[PDB]
Amino acid sequence: LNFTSMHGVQPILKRIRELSQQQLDGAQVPHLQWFRDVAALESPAGLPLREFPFAVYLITGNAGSGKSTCVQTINEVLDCVVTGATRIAAQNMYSGAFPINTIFHEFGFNHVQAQLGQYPYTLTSNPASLEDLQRRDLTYYWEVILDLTKRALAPAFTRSNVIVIDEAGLLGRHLLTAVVYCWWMINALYHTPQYAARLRPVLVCVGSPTQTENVLTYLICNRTLREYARLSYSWAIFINNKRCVEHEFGNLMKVLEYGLPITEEHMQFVDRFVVPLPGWTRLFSSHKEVSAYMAKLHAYLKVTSKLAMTITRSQGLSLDKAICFTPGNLLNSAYVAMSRTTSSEFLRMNLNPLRERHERDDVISEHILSALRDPNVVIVY
Amino acid sequence: PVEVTALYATDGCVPVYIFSYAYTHDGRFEESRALYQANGDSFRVTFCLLGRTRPMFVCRFDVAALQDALAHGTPLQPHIATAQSPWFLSKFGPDEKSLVLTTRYYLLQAQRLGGGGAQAIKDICATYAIPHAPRPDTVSAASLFAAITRFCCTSQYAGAAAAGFPLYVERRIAADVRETSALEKFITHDRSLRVSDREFITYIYLAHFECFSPPRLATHLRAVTTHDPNPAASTEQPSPLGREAVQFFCHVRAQLSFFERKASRNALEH
Numbered sequence: 093l094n095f096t097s098m099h100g101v102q103p104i105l106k107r108i109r110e111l112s113q114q115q116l117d118g119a120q121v122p123h124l125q126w127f128r129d130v131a132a133l134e135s136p137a138g139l140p141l142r143e144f145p146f147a148v149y150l151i152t153g154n155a156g157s158g159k160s161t162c163v164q165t166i167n168e169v170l171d172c173v174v175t176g177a178t179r180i181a182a183q184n185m186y187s188g189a190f191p192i193n194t195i196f197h198e199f200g201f202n203h204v205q206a207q208l209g210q211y212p213y214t215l216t217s218n219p220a221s222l223e224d225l226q227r228r229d230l231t232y233y234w235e236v237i238l239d240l241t242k243r244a245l246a247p248a249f250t251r252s253n254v255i256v257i258d259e260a261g262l263l264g265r266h267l268l269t270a271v272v273y274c275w276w277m278i279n280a281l282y283h284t285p286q287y288a289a290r291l292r293p294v295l296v297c298v299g300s301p302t303q304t305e306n307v308l309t310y311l312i313c314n315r316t317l318r319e320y321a322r323l324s325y326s327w328a329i330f331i332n333n334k335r336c337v338e339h340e341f342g343n344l345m346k347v348l349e350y351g352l353p354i355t356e357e358h359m360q361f362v363d364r365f366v367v368p369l370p371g372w373t374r375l376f377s378s379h380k381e382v383s384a385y386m387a388k389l390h391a392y393l394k395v396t397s398k399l400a401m402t403i404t405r406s407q408g409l410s411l412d413k414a415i416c417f418t419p420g421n422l423l424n425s426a427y428v429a430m431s432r433t434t435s436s437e438f439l440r441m442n443l444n445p446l447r448e449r450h451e452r453d454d455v456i457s458e459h460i461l462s463a464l465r466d467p468n469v470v471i472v473y
Numbered sequence: 474p475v476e477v478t479a480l481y482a483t484d485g486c487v488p489v490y491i492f493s494y495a496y497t498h499d500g501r502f503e504e505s506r507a508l509y510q511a512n513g514d515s516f517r518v519t520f521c522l523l524g525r526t527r528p529m530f531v532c533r534f535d536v537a538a539l540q541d542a543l544a545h546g547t548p549l550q551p552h553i554a555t556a557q558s559p560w561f562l563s564k565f566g567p568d569e570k571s572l573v574l575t576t577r578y579y580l581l582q583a584q585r586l587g588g589g590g591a592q593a594i595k596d597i598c599a600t601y602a603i604p605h606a607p608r609p610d611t612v613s614a615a616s617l618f619a620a621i622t623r624f625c626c627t628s629q630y631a632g633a634a635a636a637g638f639p640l641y642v643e644r645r646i647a648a649d650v651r652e653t654s655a656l657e658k659f660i661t662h663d664r665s666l667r668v669s670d671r672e673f674i675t676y677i678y679l680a681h682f683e684c685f686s687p688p689r690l691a692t693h694l695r696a697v698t699t700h701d702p703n704p705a706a707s708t709e710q711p712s713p714l715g716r717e718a719v720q721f722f723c724h725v726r727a728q729l730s731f732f733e734r735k736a737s738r739n740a741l742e743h
């Protein structure tokens with residue numbers, strides 16, 4: 093029975109409260125004018141450099157590691173607005189203990205089609221101070237933040253300053269600052285008791301860093317954001333898995349996630365799922381190669397559906413029971429697909445994605461190892 | 474006198490049914506045991522719906538009819554001259570020892586602001602092993618609160634059993650926290666000359682099983698089970714969890730490759 097969680101959410105609620113209570117100084121608060129000014133510009137070149145202050149708490153871990161129960165506890169202790177990346181996460185975090193919408197809905201989303209990146213920009217001081225970063229992030233959603241800024245100047249963020257956002261891996265880096273801005277842009281508009289109180293928006297982003305640059309990478313990786321949010325004092329990691337009950341497979345998913353050297357023993361293990369069943373979910377690595385079952389799978393009912401996806405589209409998806417990726421175009425890519433089904437009595441694969449040449453990314457794993465080594469990061473089993 | 478907080482519900486989403494409920498201003502078990510007879514002149518009531526409960530009105534109170542409502546679960550006639558579906562049968566609804574005590578703690582009795590102020594664990598009432606003296610007619614069969622109010626209000630658990638619930642919650646959490654805190658200090662202080670990362674995962678994932686494995690967690694729950702509510706003879710005991718973990722945390726020889734040896738063993742027995 094999960095119990096160590098009941099005693100690891102405790103220190104998390106302490107730090108989340110310490111962050112949700114603190115009040116900024118005088119000037120360190122977006123004045124209302126700073127928003128019409130953004131609405132007063134035609135090219136993201138008139139944007140004046142200046143902080144939008146914020147603090148963030150990271151709850152990260154493997155899929156099925158117990159992040160859901162930490163959200164369940166925080167929802168029922170702290171006053172928070174609970175949200176998700178995409179309606180998968182929304183229908184996930186949605187009610188078995190005591191509504192929930194996507195974080196895109198919270199700041200509003202015409203706003204769908206976006207020519208993001210159209211307008212240009214370059215940074216200045218190499219260790220860009222937050223003011224340099226947000227100057228870029230606001231630019232990225234020009235024609236997105238622009239309509240949002242014009243309309244509101246022409247309110248769930250106004251209820252609480254703790255904002256739970258599950259599945260942060262689906263949101264790009266430019267959504268860390270946007271959710272900041274449209275928070276400050278709403279609290280400063282209506283003048284809610286939060287605004288008078290000088291409270292910084294405390295975001296609690298929960299999601300898998302290695303299993304799906306996004307928000308989590310933008311916080312874990314950038315030096316200035318680490319120094320600003322003090323992620324040493326604002327990080328808790330759920331080392332566990334309640335759906336993998338076999339030793340070898342759990343070791344595979346552990347040598348993959350935390351980035352340690354592959355072993356010929358592990359290779360030997362993986363040479364047991366290679367198979368060149370009507371249920372095994374056919375994940376792929378091309379959006380054309382999934383329709384390719386127009387020929388083989390479709391009309392196979394003529395002679396005789398989550399079934400077809402791409403591995404990078406199945407991230408954060410829920411599967412019950414065969415990777416058919418194209419060779420040469422695949423170690424952090426299979427990890428997304430192999431971890432959908434709970435056990436290895438349903439996984440199938442077509443090329444042994446550990447002896448075949450592949451592409452391995454290791455920045456996130458390096459930071460995760462250094463973080464677990466940090467004495468001030470909460471670890472929960 | 475008696476300040477009573479009545480958590481109430483109504484057939485037409487808001488008669489009134491106090492489906493759980495009383496304190497006196499101080500200036501601990503025994504006084505409540507003397508209040509839960511089987512004891513106040515005046516019952517001033519704060520009637521509340523879903524701290525996690527918000528007062529909806531107040532009534533000063535004929536302590537006769539009110540005591541009737543609190544005791545034999547009777548509904549107050551709107552004698553009061555002074556939400557969700559009956560849901561409430563799904564949540565908080567395994568059985569009596571949970572339905573009558575955890576409802577009264579979670580929503581009502583964290584006003585004492587204990588370290589239990591914090592979740593709906595319904596996981597400490599089960600380590601609350603007070604003897605169950607059975608009774609017939611306890612067939613739930615409840616779907617449109619009197620059907621559940623009588624059920625709740627005349628059960629033996631809520632007496633000296635009720636008075637010893639907050640104290641046991643606190644005691645539970647205290648021993649648990651001391652053991653988990655000592656274990657956490659031993660885990661953290663050992664993440665500070667460090668090993669090649671190949672077996673740093675072996676260290677973390679093996680320490681977090683040498684101190685919170687299912688069998689040793691069960692042993693701890695045994696060392697923290699309570700049979701009589703009276704704090705005097707409560708049948709708790711020193712927990713072995715720290716003492717049986719410090720069988721594994723003899724990493725002091727690592728001051729003058731071992732983790733996968735224990736990993737291989739543990740993995741064999743698991």
Ligand SMILES: Cc1nc(N(C)C(=O)Cc2ccc(-c3ccccn3)cc2)sc1S(N)(=O)=O
Pocket residue numbers: 154331332333336337342343345346349675678679680682735736737739740741743
């Ligand atoms: C004997 C033993 N049992 C141990 N348990 C309970 C576990 O691994 C349980 C587990 C299994 C899989 C994961 C996981 C980790 C990353 C990605 C996916 N899944 C985590 C935890 S760990 C040891 S050992 N060899 O260190 O003494």
